[PDB]
Amino acid sequence: GCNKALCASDVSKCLIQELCQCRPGEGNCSCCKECMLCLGALWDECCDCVGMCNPRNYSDTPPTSKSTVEELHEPIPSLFRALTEGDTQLNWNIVSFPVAEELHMCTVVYFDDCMSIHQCKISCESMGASKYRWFHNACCECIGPECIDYGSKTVKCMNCMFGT
Amino acid sequence: GCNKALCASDVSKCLIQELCQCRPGEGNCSCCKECMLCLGALWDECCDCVGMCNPRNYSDTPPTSKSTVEELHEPIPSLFRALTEGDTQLNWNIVSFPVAEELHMCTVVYFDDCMSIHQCKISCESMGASKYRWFHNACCECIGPECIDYGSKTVKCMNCMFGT
Ligand SMILES: [Pt+2]
Ligand SMILES: [Pt+2]
Ligand SMILES: [Pt+2]
Ligand SMILES: [Pt+2]
Ligand SMILES: [Pt+2]
Ligand SMILES: [Pt+2]
Ligand SMILES: [Pt+2]
Ligand SMILES: [Pt+2]
């Protein structure tokens, strides 16, 4: 967790000054701003040692955790509904879930085969979608006009489950 | 707009069949699914010609339009409040706006100097922020525990206005 070699000098200096005596983890941390100021430039790499921030990660972050979301110019809701309601394309998996679950109803389209972001944007634009979310596993999720937000964080598209 | 050389053959073939006779732009487009099926693989690059999708872009998309958003593991709201309420760091610009404006109140932090995404994530994590949004102009916006969503789409951080 703590990087002792980098941080021991300055961290001790703050401790001697008696800063960073307050734990954020339970209750208010009155001293947190003062502790950050005393650490200065080393706060990012040494806040773990004083307990003010989480230890340097013990875990490997899944690629799916990142996603990049953009809102398409000039959405065409009628096209999106027309291509969604009817017998959906096999390459397309269609999910409708109640709107604001991710935080009437929100409908999204999950492309099957994994695709590049630029392709994902083009395909959503051709679909009339209001917005698209591109998972960094490369799964593509067009977002419908109804949806308030960017839709489900889940990588629900078949034939690209990588990251699970 | 329309790519005549690529699309003229197939597009004419659909037109002769009398598909793509319905405009999505005003009113329902009954034929939209049939038109897409007739186009098949060329729908993405030729839907403009039949009017079912917007013409290939006349405009250069600003870099700021893309952003990538991730939610930090183990957020520490007390730290975020402690470092936000008090005399804010000069490198940090602090904006509080009513929650759900982007779609009680949502508070976000806009880093001044433009930074890489990995740095932006580390700095937000040290800040206790629930989530971070990284603009592709490279402006970094940590997102507070209060905020329902990912916060303002605006690139409001000083000393990285590139893309405006
Ligand atoms: Pt700091
Ligand atoms: Pt429902
Ligand atoms: Pt399947
Ligand atoms: Pt799966
Ligand atoms: Pt299609
Ligand atoms: Pt307010
Ligand atoms: Pt400024
Ligand atoms: Pt500006």
Author numbering:
A (entry chain A), B (entry chain A): 25 to 127, 165 to 225
Copy text from the publication.
Twisted gastrulation (TWSG1) is an evolutionarily conserved secreted glycoprotein which controls signaling by Bone Morphogenetic Proteins (BMPs). TWSG1 binds BMPs and their antagonist Chordin to control BMP signaling during embryonic development, kidney regeneration and cancer. TWSG1 is composed of two distinct, disulfide-rich domains. The TWSG1 N-terminal domain occupies the BMP type 1 receptor binding site on BMPs, whereas the C-terminal domain binds to a Chordin family member.
We crystallized and determined the TWSG1 structure at 2.6 Å resolution using a platinum single-wavelength anomalous diffraction experiment. TWSG1 crystallized as a dimer in the asymmetric unit, an arrangement that we observed in two crystal forms. The structure of TWSG1 reveals a modular architecture, comprising an α-helical N-terminal domain (NTD, Cys26–Arg80) connected by an extended 18 Å-long linker to a mixed-α/β C-terminal domain (CTD, Pro87–Phe223). The NTD of TWSG1 folds into a compact bundle of three α-helices locked by 7 disulfides. The CTD of TWSG1 is stabilized by 5 disulfide bonds (VIII–XII) and contains a sheet comprised of 5 antiparallel β-strands which constitute its core.
